[PDB]
Amino acid sequence: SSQIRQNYSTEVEAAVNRLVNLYLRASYTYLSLGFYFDRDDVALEGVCHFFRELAEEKREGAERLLKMQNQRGGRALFQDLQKPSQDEWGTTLDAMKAAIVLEKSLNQALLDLHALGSAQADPHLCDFLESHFLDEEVKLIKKMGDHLTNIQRLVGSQAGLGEYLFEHCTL
Amino acid sequence: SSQIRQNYSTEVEAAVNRLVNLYLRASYTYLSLGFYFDRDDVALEGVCHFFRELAEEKREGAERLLKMQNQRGGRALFQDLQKPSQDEWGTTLDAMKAAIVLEKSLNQALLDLHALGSAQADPHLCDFLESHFLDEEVKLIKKMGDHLTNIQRLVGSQAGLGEYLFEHCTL
């Protein structure tokens, strides 16, 4: 059973298991994104590598949650990992948009679990999320927003392309 | 506009801009303090260096807030930086007293923004302040209180001066 569990509600335990599922599903979505850009008829290896690295980060996030589940004396329970929402991911722009949607949904789930932990007076959980997940997600979303802007600029116009080249190759 | 902003209230955005102003104003006060002690008719270079280093720390605090503003998808807005409250800063004791007043006012502003973030259920903001600012301010205020005590002891009496020398040159 558990000799260790203290101040760890069944509501948080359940929500932690759900968040693990969401992180693993995110990892799986990114695996699909990465191999799509590795297709010979797409062939954007930088984009492939970006998404494959994100698959690894999301997996690592799930494993940290699972480690924490056991540290608190909760019981990891795994569900079906639903296949990604698309089989083909369109352009770099389409993919980066789908990625930011995905991250904002993980972010919201983190914030929801944080609010639950707060309601349950579970400061360990709250700190765990703050320390390992909330700032990581904020940083990643800012980087993806940056990328979305640059992709839009580059695909949009002569002026846009110009500004990118000056910044990248001069500054 | 912003593709990234999530769970980031207009109230916090505004308060962050105000706190940047207060940190920059603090930095400017410390620049003035440092150059006052560099005057040939004051000539306390250790005191000058202490305040100039604080000017840099307060600037760095503002820049971290501005970075965070952008990471959250808020919009940095800058105001007039009001000149420091004094043109001449009196003795080392007067200056260290003015410094602790200034830090306690920054501290209170941090605590006020923390309470706002808490009311707004913005755990990212709360953690950001805790991790980068609240303990830094507590440590600095304790160091300034230490200094105030030693300055008072040294300027006050034979017994005071004695105790300082034993501690400094023997212990």
Added chain:
Amino acid sequence: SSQIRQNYSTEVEAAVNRLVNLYLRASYTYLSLGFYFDRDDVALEGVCHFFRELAEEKREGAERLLKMQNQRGGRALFQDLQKPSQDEWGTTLDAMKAAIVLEKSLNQALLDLHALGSAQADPHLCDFLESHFLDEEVKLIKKMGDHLTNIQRLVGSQAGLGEYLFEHCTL
């Protein structure tokens, strides 16, 4: 008071204090420019870094002036730092144009203070400006003019973009 002041007119002392203000205001303008380009909806990090580095250079210029003020036995007096002329800075081209306007205004202020020092027969001041500021400003303005030309070329046309790429990636 001052045991050291020699050949240092009240007119130069005052003008030095004003120039410190202008350099600090320039630094503040560049802080605003840098964080604008760090926005997720602008996202030109090279441009951000260029302006943030200029903020630091302008701050260092003010500190050197303040050091010189004290070395001559003048009294540093600080005024309100007026907020930058814009909250949003437009394109890279708009920003680099605003930057060169700003530098030419600092340059003219340097030349005006130089003429004053010359009228006042203050060769120390004249040399200080020549040695630490006039050539620095000339070099920076030439670099910004270079940048303005390249930005215009890159945003302007196929021929322009072509010439830039050949120069950058071949030569």
Added chain:
Amino acid sequence: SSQIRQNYSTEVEAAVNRLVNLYLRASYTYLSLGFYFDRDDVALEGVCHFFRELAEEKREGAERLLKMQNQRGGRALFQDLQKPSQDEWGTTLDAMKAAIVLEKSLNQALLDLHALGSAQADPHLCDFLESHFLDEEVKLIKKMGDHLTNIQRLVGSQAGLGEYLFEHCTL
């Protein structure tokens, strides 16, 4: 005779010879100051070393002027070096006051020679003084003013002594 002399007035040549004399006399005054503080009944070796180092700097200043005299095709002419104005130099405070008087008189002589060079349209001379002497004198006078303030503070009072110790042994 001189195959090299160009744009080098007899007025500047003469004034350069006089300035060499003043620098050598300053060096001699500092030699006397240094050995006075080496007396067993005075015994302030730090003060001795400060003045002996200044004797060397003033000698080096004269030698640089003499080198410049020859580089311009002028003729070094040496006069009697008058013995220092005092045989005994009183307290550290008295000595540092006499030192700043001496430096201000060298400084004024530099500024006078600068004005002559300017009147004579001799930019080489003007630059030579600016580059090797005017800023050196400004820095040294600021350091002596600093010292005068600290000596006065230390000899004056409990509060003064206190402030010095805090700055020196804490900051």
